[PDB]
Design a protein around this ligand. Structure first.
Ligand SMILES: [Mg+2]
Ligand SMILES: [Mg+2]
Ligand SMILES: [Mg+2]
Ligand SMILES: [Mg+2]
Ligand SMILES: [Mg+2]
Ligand SMILES: [Mg+2]
Ligand SMILES: [Mg+2]
Ligand SMILES: [Mg+2]
Ligand SMILES: [Mg+2]
Ligand SMILES: [Mg+2]
Ligand SMILES: [Mg+2]
Ligand SMILES: [Mg+2]
Ligand SMILES: [Mg+2]
Ligand SMILES: [Mg+2]
Ligand SMILES: [Mg+2]
Ligand SMILES: [Mg+2]
Ligand SMILES: [Mg+2]
Ligand SMILES: [Mg+2]
Ligand SMILES: [Mg+2]
Ligand SMILES: [Mg+2]
Ligand SMILES: [Mg+2]
Ligand SMILES: [Mg+2]
Ligand SMILES: [Mg+2]
Ligand SMILES: [Mg+2]
Ligand SMILES: [Mg+2]
Ligand SMILES: [Mg+2]
Ligand SMILES: [Mg+2]
Ligand SMILES: [Mg+2]
Ligand SMILES: [Mg+2]
Ligand SMILES: [Mg+2]
Lengths: 50, 99, 62, 69
RNA sequence: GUGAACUAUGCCUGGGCAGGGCGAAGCCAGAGGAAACUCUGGUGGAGGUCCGUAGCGGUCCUGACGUGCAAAUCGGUCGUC
RNA sequence: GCCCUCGGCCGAUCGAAAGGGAGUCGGGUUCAGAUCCCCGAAUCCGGAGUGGCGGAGAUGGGCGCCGCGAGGCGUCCAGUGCGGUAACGCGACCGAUCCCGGAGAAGCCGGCGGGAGCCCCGGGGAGAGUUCUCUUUUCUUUGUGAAGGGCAGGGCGCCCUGGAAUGGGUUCGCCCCGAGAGAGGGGCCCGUGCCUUGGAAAGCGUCGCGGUUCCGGCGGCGUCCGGUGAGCUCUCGCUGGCCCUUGAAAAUCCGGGGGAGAGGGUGUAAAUCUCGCGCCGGGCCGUACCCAUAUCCGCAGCAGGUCUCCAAGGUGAACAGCCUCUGGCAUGUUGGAACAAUGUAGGUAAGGGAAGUCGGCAAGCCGGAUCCGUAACUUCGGGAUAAGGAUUGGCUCUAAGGGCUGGGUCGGUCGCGGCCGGCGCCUAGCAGCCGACUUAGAACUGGUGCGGA
């Protein structure tokens, strides 16, 4: 809702800050074995439990 | 009430005739729902060789004037070039559509 | 144009009305209008002394 | 906004300390003198042209006498 | 141990519910009687009142659908308002 | 700091983004934010020891002289304002503990009235549309926020004079009156309406001039005059009805009673001030967007579910249905071509008319309104739209139903108009003007159609 509390705004701020793709130099790092961010959230598919 | 109706440009380039347009108004005016005879001499139309004054002593209306000149332009197949605007109070001046 | 015709009385009919007579023109509104008219007339007559208090009261009650 | 009736009252509020500005608005029928002070905008309306002119002459110095044209 | 975000019921604080029909008490007038009163015409606008919207519900078609639009929905017809 | 005096919030605290709760509006601006940014107008709360400036408190009388007198001299005594018979008013107009009250703070339903907004009608503009014929036409547009001041309007069981039956005022309904009617004169409250300040400089509509790759450019003209109403929707008010139902509390703010106290010795004074102006400040958190036949829940862009606000024209009883404007959309997760059966949904059907079937299931019939006319039975309320019948279009008329004004005998003289009077009898009222929607009747008319969907 538009009526938020400060700490639910902080929670959503953290979640949308970390819903972000992986950088591309990570793949060039030695011994990487990670291809994409595997825990990306889409707002329509998987909902925050909050 | 001196509803000066002014058309210098079209008679300037010779595409309409002020005399027969004055005749058109002289027949098809209305005063209390009567055509011809100017209500019985109660409205007076003079043409000063480039424009027409329609002096009167009754509550006659210039929106009726604009309606009649639009009717004349439509009848003589002219209102794709000409356009009746209010250049001032108590007067209507025809203008050409953008060049 | 149809409002002008209905002013002259056209399309008012008996096959043109769908609500009841009280729905189209209420009897309470009719009676209220009549009482206001007649009471105002009685008050004017009493003011101009065409009638007096006693005639006014009997005519008011009637 | 306050509306002032007399020239003497207008002059003392014009020479008041907090009087920030004066704007002169020339209307068709009259002239308005709007002095901007701290809390209110005060307006004086004059119908006489020569009286408005001599008031413009007799306005105290050290003020903004801005015409609105 | 965890649940009354559904539902059941109480409480607190808010929101909502066209248009019409019938015409209770109270009241005004006229007429008839010795009274008691009676009759007539209005006025008035009552009711877990009636027809019927929104809303709430869910009768029947044992209609549609029945690997559905839907792990109970849809249409017409209905109940109440 | 100690002592004295006084003291129930007698119970922490939490609990509402719909209850209570001071005080912000107009215009502009973005790719996306605005009552939050910019511009312009305000306002509330808190603060002021040296008090910031005004104004109020507050500045008058008595007696002796001088001085023509005015006016001065000295002495003595007041002064916590004043007006109105009153309701109450005025710009301030001392005052504590304590006490009393009020506001916050009251249901649902009905009926009327006032105000606005919307809708509607008649003209004037401006710009568009139609012009085969007609149409002085059709469509669009035709502003003034908050906060001050003034005036309408509405309301008042508020005041004074006076005394009412031949009872009278008065509402749609009521209701009111010797516990004070009608009448006459006032007062208060509300004022969201109008005028003004704001305010035309802005906005809007048109007509133009020049380019800062896009100026809150620059200019002209305009933004006018009226009328209706059981209209609808808000809102304010009055008065009823209903209830073995009587429809919060508290923060918070105000008024009064009382008078412990405080203020100065007559000064160009004090205490004090809910008056006017001025000065400073207002932190913290939310604020985008969706709000649902695609942003939520139902595993999904799911025919389900999910609380609200605003609400145009026509027909019509109507927020019914049907069509249209503002706004919105692209047919609901695809298209093309054919038009078999069987379906699903919708129609029609000769003659019969429930013979069908468990069963009139389903479908059909009926339907609105106006005028008649309505049975048994009954708890006397009802039954009841019982049952039954007639009418219904279009067009042209005729009646009836209202609201404003003025009805004046004569200069007997002058303040072609005015002061007092000889001067005169609509008194069954007329005369003029304005304005609605209805209802009833009649004629004509149509391929008997007319609640035509
Ligand atoms: Mg979801
Ligand atoms: Mg619950
Ligand atoms: Mg009922
Ligand atoms: Mg229903
Ligand atoms: Mg169903
Ligand atoms: Mg079935
Ligand atoms: Mg019912
Ligand atoms: Mg205690
Ligand atoms: Mg709390
Ligand atoms: Mg709250
Ligand atoms: Mg937005
Ligand atoms: Mg204004
Ligand atoms: Mg009285
Ligand atoms: Mg302008
Ligand atoms: Mg312009
Ligand atoms: Mg928003
Ligand atoms: Mg859905
Ligand atoms: Mg789930
Ligand atoms: Mg449809
Ligand atoms: Mg389709
Ligand atoms: Mg498609
Ligand atoms: Mg879809
Ligand atoms: Mg058959
Ligand atoms: Mg047959
Ligand atoms: Mg059978
Ligand atoms: Mg059989
Ligand atoms: Mg058989
Ligand atoms: Mg059936
Ligand atoms: Mg029966
Ligand atoms: Mg007929």
């Amino acid at each position: 809702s538009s009526h938020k509390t400060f700490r639910i705004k902080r929670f959503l701020a953290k979640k949308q800050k970390q819903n972000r793709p992986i950088p591309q130099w990570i793949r060039m790092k030695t011994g990487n074995k990670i291809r994409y961010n595997s825990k990306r959230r889409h707002w329509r598919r998987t909902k925050l439990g909050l | 009430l001196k509803f000066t109706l002014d058309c210098t440009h079209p008679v300037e380039d010779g595409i309409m005739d002020a005399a027969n347009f004055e005749q058109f108004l002289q027949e098809r005016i209305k005063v209390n729902g009567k055509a011809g005879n100017l209500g019985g001499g109660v409205v007076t139309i003079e043409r000063s060789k480039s424009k027409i004054t329609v002096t009167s002593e009754v509550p006659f209306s210039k929106r009726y004037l604009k309606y009649l000149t639009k009717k004349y332009l439509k009848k003589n197949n002219l209102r794709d070039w000409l356009r009746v605007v209010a250049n001032s109070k108590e007067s209507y001046e025809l203008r050409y559509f953008q060049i | 144009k149809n409002t002008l015709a209905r002013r002259k009385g056209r399309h008012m009919g008996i096959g043109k009305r769908k609500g009841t007579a009280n729905a189209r023109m209420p009897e309470k509104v009719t009676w209220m209008r009549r009482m206001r008219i007649l009471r105002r007339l009685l008050r004017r007559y009493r003011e101009s002394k065409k009638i007096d208090r006693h005639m006014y009261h009997s005519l008011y009650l009637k | 906004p306050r509306k002032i009736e007399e020239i003497k009252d207008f002059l003392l509020t014009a020479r008041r300390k907090d009087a920030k500005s004066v704007k002169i608005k020339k209307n068709k029928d009259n002239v308005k003198f709007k002095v901007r002070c701290s809390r209110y905008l005060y307006t004086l309306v004059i119908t006489d042209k020569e009286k408005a002119e001599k008031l413009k002459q007799s306005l105290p110095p050290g003020l903004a006498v801005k015409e609105l044209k």
